[PDB]
Amino acid sequence: IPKGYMDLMPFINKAGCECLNESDEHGFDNCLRKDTTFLESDCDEQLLITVAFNQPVKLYSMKFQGPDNGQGPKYVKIFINLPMDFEEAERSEPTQALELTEDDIKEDGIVPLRYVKFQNVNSVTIFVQSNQGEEETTRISYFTFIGTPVQ
Amino acid sequence: SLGLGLAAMGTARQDVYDLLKTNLYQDDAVTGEAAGLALGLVMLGSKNAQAIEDMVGYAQETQHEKILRGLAVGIALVMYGRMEEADALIESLCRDKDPILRRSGMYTVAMAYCGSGNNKAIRRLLHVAVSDVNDDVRRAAVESLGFILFRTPEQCPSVVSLLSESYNPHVRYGAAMALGICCAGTGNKEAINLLEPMTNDPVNYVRQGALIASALIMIQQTEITCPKVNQFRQLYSKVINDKHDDVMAKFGAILAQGILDAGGHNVTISLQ
Amino acid sequence: TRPANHRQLTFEEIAKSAKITVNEVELLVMKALSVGLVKGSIDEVDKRVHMTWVQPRVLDLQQIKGMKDRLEFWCTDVKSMEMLVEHQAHDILT
Amino acid sequence: LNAKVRLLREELQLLQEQGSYVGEVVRAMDKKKVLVKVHPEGKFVVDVDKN
Amino acid sequence: EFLHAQEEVKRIQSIPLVIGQFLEAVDQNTAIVGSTTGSNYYVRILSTIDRELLKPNASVALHKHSNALV
Amino acid sequence: LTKQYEKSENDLKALQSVGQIVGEVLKQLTEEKFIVKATNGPRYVVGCRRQLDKSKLKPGTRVALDMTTLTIMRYLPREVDPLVYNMSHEDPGNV
Amino acid sequence: PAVDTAEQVYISSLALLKMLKHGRAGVPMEVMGLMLGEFVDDYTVRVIDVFAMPQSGTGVSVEAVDPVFQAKMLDMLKQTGRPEMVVGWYHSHPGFGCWLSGVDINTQQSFEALSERAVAVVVDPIQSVKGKVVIDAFRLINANMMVLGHEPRQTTSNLGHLNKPSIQALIHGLNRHYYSITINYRKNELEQKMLLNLHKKSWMEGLTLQDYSEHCKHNESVVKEMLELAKNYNKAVEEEDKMTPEQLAIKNVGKQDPKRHLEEHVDVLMTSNIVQCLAAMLDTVVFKLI
Amino acid sequence: LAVQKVVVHPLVLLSVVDHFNRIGKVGNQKRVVGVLLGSWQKKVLDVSNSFAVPFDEDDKDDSVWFLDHDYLENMYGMFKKVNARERIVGWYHTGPKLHKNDIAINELMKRYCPNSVLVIIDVKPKDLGLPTEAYISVEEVHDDGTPTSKTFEHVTSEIGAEEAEEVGVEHLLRDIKDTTVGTLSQRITNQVHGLKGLNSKLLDIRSYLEKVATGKLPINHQIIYQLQDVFNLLPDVSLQEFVKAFYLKTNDQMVVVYLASLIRSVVALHNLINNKIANRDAEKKE
Amino acid sequence: MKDKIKENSEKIKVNKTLPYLVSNVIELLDVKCAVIKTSTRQTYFLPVIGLVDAEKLKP
Amino acid sequence: HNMSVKAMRFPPKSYNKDLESAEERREREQQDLEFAKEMAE
Amino acid sequence: VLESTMVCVDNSEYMRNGDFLPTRLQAQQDAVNIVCHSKTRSNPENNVGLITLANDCEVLTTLTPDTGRILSKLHTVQPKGKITFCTGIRVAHLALKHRQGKNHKMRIIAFVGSPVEDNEKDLVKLAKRLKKEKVNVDIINFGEEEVNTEKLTAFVNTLNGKDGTGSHLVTVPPGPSLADALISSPILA
Ligand SMILES: [Zn+2]
């Protein structure tokens, strides 16, 4: 993790982090884990993550990793503190639309975030619009947000 | 950040700018004010798009006012002495809905048109001073007049003389500061004659601005060069030793004493 | 049928078009005026009925096109003076 | 116009200054002292303004 | 600003207001008024006051604190 | 006792209450301005509560005013004097 | 850490109107409510919205905050996209200035125990006039710190001393038991244009012609009024020729000025007739049968 | 009808805008629906407060829509405690125009207020018209024989303020509002706005007739009936009787303007005399 | 509740501290309420009587 | 009227001198300080 | 588990039948009483609400941590009109999206007591939208299961998918009481 900003994965409510269009065999619990197990989808490669934090938290950077087989993300739209139906992601204003490149999606790439727009984040939803190889489904890895609590 | 920008004025160093922009992007109120000011100092007169786009773009996204205040001064320094090459930025800043970014346009006019006496720039500052919604922008609009007229000092005590008596105390403070900035070190009799009534203004900070401006006008000045230097030197002492005067009236008086005898009576202020 | 400029029907036209004697024209207009089918007044000295209003009726598509064509002229007149007052009173317009 | 605006803003503060009593002078005294009768409040020995 | 200054001055007329009696106009802006509390005061008059209405023996509302003719 | 607590608690709520100046309505100037006169005191140009009827505030009506704002709280019935009360409630002696 | 005088309390356009509406309706009761918002940083307190508290009973003073009412309203406002914490409380002072009394200081200590940067905003709906609302934001001074010889807050700028404290507030403990935080207002373009619709007449009224029978009658009456005023105006000219300069204003007090009323009658008639003529001329072409 | 005029206060407009800006956040940009609160004075409604209610609908199907009516009751009681004199008078929604499903929503709101008034509050800053369009549900009895149906009848809407409400509004509009313009300039600006409003409404009717002409929309025969009345009411300004009366009236007003202008010149010369006397006297002593 | 009662009585002793302003009861209204005339020649309306039973007061 | 208004000349008098004097305005602040320092205590 | 549920009661004309003793409407009133109570005891923060499946779907009560008001509303529910299963789920889905607590899990209880009169394509696309939104609807196939066994099969199979165990299609044959088959049903398990 970058100096001065911790890995916020333990901070989040594991019981309360829901996922949308997630294949049962690999789910959100396996997504947050550092191990090989992923979060694949069933309906389409399109997928909607929802992440609710325990306490107010700032997001400095994220590590939304995916396998380099092509199922990794190539278009991530991040939404902050929504008062999301797979049609809003089609037409809305993301906090920071992110084209996660192959370097960004590997096991070592971190994705910088606009720290200006990520300051008071009680709940965050990340949407995978498109993957890299135009496959039917996607796959994720230990998607963790790097930052500090609001305090 | 203040130390780095002060030690890297006009160096246009990418490493200094990159590190400072990292501190600014942290969205911290205290360090944001520091980084924003330092960003302008490092990129002073560079007028590059990237520094302008990053800094002005940050100002429209940050929710901290202190960061905006530092950026407003910083944005102006990026386009210092840039003459008409700052027209595109100035009109963008002056039309902004953010009061602080509107203040940055006033400062940008001052730095881009420093000593040029450009009547088009003076036309813009006077328009904002008399017709604006925010008193801070009005106070900065009058203040920016001094940077445009210092090369021709006799002209400020005529454009600012009427603003010196306006209903708005912020414009009155700006008129005091405009006289101080333009007539700095000149010992202008006409400018001092305007500030002498200001030192008894009903509003406290207007008095402070006149006291500080009076020191800047006649720094190093003696009795023969300016007969009123002894009058103000006692006035500074009287305000400080007045237990019943406002605290910020005394702040101007104390700073006036330091400016009046700065550098051991061996320094002067001269923008030229 | 007649335009609003020429809505002054003589007794002869009412007598001829309605197949009634001229002396029965007056009573015919009373029934129309009393029921409310038409609005106006009768000038017995000049043998003329001054018609001011008719019950609105069903119009074809073609007559609706003609009605819209009147709106185009009406719209232009309103816009013409809207620009006239704006131009003439520009200094004092708030 | 500017003085008219300035006088109006200062008037609001000036109107909040407490009003002056109305008294009747009995007899002037030494050391710029005067014996007056405030309307409901009896007699006082008061100083006199320098003007 | 003159219209704004005129409008913001009217807060001197906010209720409650003690009722006085206009006795005499000393000059343009000051007058002698008799408050219903029983005391005669030499006070200032609001500039936005129609002086045509300051007839003798006229009921006037005075500032509750400063007794000014408001 | 549970009832003792209620009486002591009702006492505490009573303590927070403040007395109201008794006056008399002289004339209703505006829809929100009234001229009232204190029972033994000066006349004021006062306001009135929004919840009040404002039709029962005819001239001469006894009213209760705030101590600070002097605004009208309520209209009170015609006051019966303590001496007049003793006149009516005076025992003849069953003669 | 020391509080700064540069701290600002930002009240939204919506939050300002609700306190004025609730405060005026509750005159003279010190009607209180909760200020929702967000502590942006150590120098800003944003008041996005407020909601009023019910009055438990009679009494012109601030009642205790009802926890169930506060909990239920906060819980329900989160259901309509209002997940903002309570950044303080507001209460009304109907005409006696903006300050904190003994009861208000105790009420503020309750909020400062929960949130150290809670703000007590006082609104004067009676003394507030158009274009100038009598509002103020207060936070308590800890008696322990100030007695020992420490300023309640550090001064790093001029921003905290631009507004001169009022004597009424200084009387009631300002700068002794509580300090004032400068209040700015967050106004956006959308909310400003929306409020500009107030008193905006319909387009029908612009082209609507005043009744000609009454217009002639009004013209009839006012011209007759100037007939007597002109007769009096002649007398005023001769009288003021022989009048001492001390009587230029004193002698005009209590006596009607013919010149002043003549101008008002002239102004009214010329506005009335020009509009009636212009609107009539416009209607002759706009509403034309040809 | 049961409602003669709806007065919508500036607090409601700000609240409705804030409702739209907080629900229509990064989530979506649909219409938001709340509940209107106000009092009744004779036959003019006095909409003075509102609260948001959870609401959603399907973009495609109009019969699928949800309104948390239990939330309605809970917050109404919350608001009733603070201000008992403010009851439910209807609902609002920020939709730029009416929707097919409003008549169903009004039925849900009709339980809490029998004469419920729907006020469409456009968050977008429309240039010429008021943002509020007040509607009430009526039972339109057609004469063609088509069965009686529930429809919305327009009620004239006005934006008015309370005394303290207008105090705050003038504070927020202190800088933007220009009050220096005299009355006569304002009245002429009203006439220009009246001309602009009429042209826009005439354009709307023309646009509707264009759709009918090309068959996009069916022939209504109630609008056309009304349209004949509009064109029949068009006065003939070429009549000899009218023109003479217009000239007779115009000259009657002109002499009054001439008299007032004549008085104005005399008063202006009196002011000039006093100024010159004051100027001459000031220099004589100095 | 005993501690609440005793703590309540403590708050009375602060408000029941001397001096008291001697007054005469003028009336006893219903809408339980009293009108008093103070020795300072002031007539006041009390929405609640106070710490004395309204039955034990007479004009 | 326009010709007469345009002919109205204002002498160049020292404006803003009819306002509150510096010495007299200082009198209120000191007196007001004792008002706050005595009535409140 | 911490989940919010809505019961899709049926009040169509067919609920007047006595196939379930004594009346299908009375049978479902007991059945709702059991499922509503069962969710309450699983977690006291459970939210339950009632929606009707009449000719036009009507939300009688939104999610609330109360049970009596659910039976209070079902008492006045009278048989009228025809089932509209298409719009009922979506309207129940809308109320779920506006729950008091976003941490709760989606859940709908459907009481189909009348045939679903739409093409299989409409049911299939409806399930995918629920599956995308992690919305689980437990449907009870009482009443006309002889014709509804195939349309609802496409619902649960598409919604649950491979190894779903999220929505069950419990089909109770006509008998003494359909509620007596609910306690052994995986809905309350
Ligand atoms: Zn208070």
Numbering used by the authors:
A (entry chain u): 119 to 201, 204 to 271
B (entry chain U): 478 to 749
C (entry chain a): 283 to 376
D (entry chain C): 52 to 102
E (entry chain D): 71 to 140
F (entry chain E): 36 to 130
G (entry chain c): 23 to 312
H (entry chain Z): 4 to 289
How does the study describe this entry?
The 26S proteasome unfolds and degrades hundreds of proteins to maintain proteostasis, regulate cellular processes and generate peptides with second messenger functions. It consists of a 20S core particle (CP) capped by one or two 19S regulatory particles (RPs) that gate access to the CP proteolytic chamber. The redox-active thioredoxin (TRX)-like protein TXNL1 is expressed in many cell types and was proposed as a nearly stoichiometric component of the human 26S proteasome. It uses its C-terminal PITH (proteasome-interacting TRX) domain for binding, while potentially reducing disulfide bonds with its N-terminal TRX domain but how it binds and is regulated remained unclear.
In both datasets, 30 s and 2 min after substrate addition, we observed non-substrate-engaged proteasomes in the RS conformation, with Rpt3 at the top of the staircase, Rpt2 at the bottom and Rpt6 as the seam subunit bound to ADP, while all other subunits were ATP bound. Interestingly, although our cryo-EM dataset showed a higher number of RS proteasomes, TXNL1’s tail was not detected interacting with Rpn11, likely because of its incompatibility with Rpn11’s Ins-1 loop in the open state. Instead, the PITH domain adopted an ensemble of conformations between Rpn2 and Rpn10, whose classification resulted in RS.1 and RS.2 states, with minor lid movement and no changes for the ATPase motor. Local refinement of the PITH domain and 3D variability analyses for both RS.1 and RS.2 allowed us to separate two major PITH domain states that we term forward (49.8 % of particles) and backward (40.5% of particles) according to the PITH domain rotation, along with a smaller number of particles showing the PITH domain in intermediate positions. Thus, in the absence of C-terminal tail binding to Rpn11, the PITH domain appears to form a ‘blurry’ interaction with the RS proteasome, using just a few contact points on Rpn2 and Rpn10’s VWA domain to swivel between forward and backward positions by ~91°. The forward position resembles the TXNL1 conformation we observed in the PS proteasomes, except that the C-terminal tail does not contact Rpn11 and is, therefore, not resolved. In the RS proteasome, TXNL1’s PITH domain makes transient ionic contacts with Rpn2 and Rpn10, yielding low-affinity binding with at least two orientations above Rpn11 that may allow dynamic association and dissociation. Titration of these stalled complexes revealed a dissociation constant KD of ~35 nM, whereas TXNL1 titrations we performed with RS proteasomes for cryo-EM structure determination let us estimate a KD in the tens of micromolar range, at least two orders of magnitude higher than for the PSs.
